């Protein structure tokens, strides 16, 4: 049985074992960061379906890569082209190129997805990326979902797009219209979130 949390499908009631993994990771991150601060090294990412009609249907999947410094790279996935480990690998590799030019980094993302397989992992290892521990079923702890994609939504409400290029202009209008303070905030809010999780002994706190 499932429920939608931050647009992501998640247990209608976490198991005891699922709250332990959340508490354990949250606790350790809070401690890690207090002793050896790393928030400012975090690169994070997720995907969101953008619906052509914001009141089956038609929609386009976007992927965004960002850090507290600001946006790094987003791309769109063409309708009917479900993404694979080897292209994600690609995505990663040019994400890294754009980053280098702005400028080791630490990646925070949902590791429990398909395109997160050997080629992908290979790429990150190869490129020198440490992946941050992340408890299963925890959208509340991924900044793209609790921050970025949430504000995107407020921006998307009541919008009808006709062509793909329109959606993309709405997204890109949105991301590009964002201050660096917007990204800085998404990331630096993590510590509070880890704490809030711990206090809830690993349950959802919002």
């Amino acid at each position: 049985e499932k429920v939608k949390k931050l647009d992501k499908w998640v247990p209608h009631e976490l198991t005891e074992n699922q709250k332990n993994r959340r508490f354990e990771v949250s606790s350790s991150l809070i401690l890690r960061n207090h002793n050896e601060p790393f928030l400012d090294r975090i690169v994070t990412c997720d995907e969101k379906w953008i619906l052509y009609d914001n009141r089956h249907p038609k929609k386009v999947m976007v992927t965004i890569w960002w850090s507290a410094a600001g946006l790094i790279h987003y791309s769109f996935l063409n309708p009917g082209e479900t993404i694979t480990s080897e292209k994600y690998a690609q995505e990663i590799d040019e994400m890294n190129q754009k980053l280098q030019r702005l400028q080791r980094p630490i990646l925070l993302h949902d590791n429990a997805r398909p395109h997160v397989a050997q080629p992908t992992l290979q790429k990150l290892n190869e490129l020198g990326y440490e992946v941050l521990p992340h408890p299963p079923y925890s959208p509340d702890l991924l900044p793209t979902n609790y921050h970025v994609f949430k504000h995107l939504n407020n921006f998307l409400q009541g919008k009808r797009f006709h062509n793909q290029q329109d959606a993309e202009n709405a997204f890109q209008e949105f991301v590009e219209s964002q201050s660096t303070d917007f990204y800085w905030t998404g990331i630096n809010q993590l510590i509070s979130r880890w704490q809030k999780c711990v206090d809830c002994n690993g349950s959802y706190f919002d």
Copy 2:
């Protein structure tokens, strides 16, 4: 399933079991490369000691670190460890750590490497580690080749226990004590400062076993 290094690990790792082992080793190597953390590790695991060694048994637990033994403890037969008891165990282990460290310049903050797969690793245990400021290193399921206790200490034990029989628990226990006391401080350092190379191999082997 099938036993490896004493513990029940599958015959074939599903493709992600091997992915997780890769994801962690890669990250741990990288993290250690950016900010060395080995010498802050405190590791521990549990092992049914057997009465004749070439059924009656006695479970032993050992906490240690690259600097030495910290604390070990036996569980009589018939007794099961409770998350609360384990929590108490941690609190005791911790107190020894600080006497051992009380000697130093700056204690740095301990990173526990241990098997969270156990069942007595639950809220009470988690609460205690948190309450004590203990970081917990990530650990891939079914990966005894990565816990030093299992691959280093417990291995050299089977190697000193072989062809030995005792007809009482105190006498088993006594054997263990004899062993760990005859280990010099850099026998422990070696179990720890060996992880890097063990992580790598897991990576070079794309998340599979390597011995």
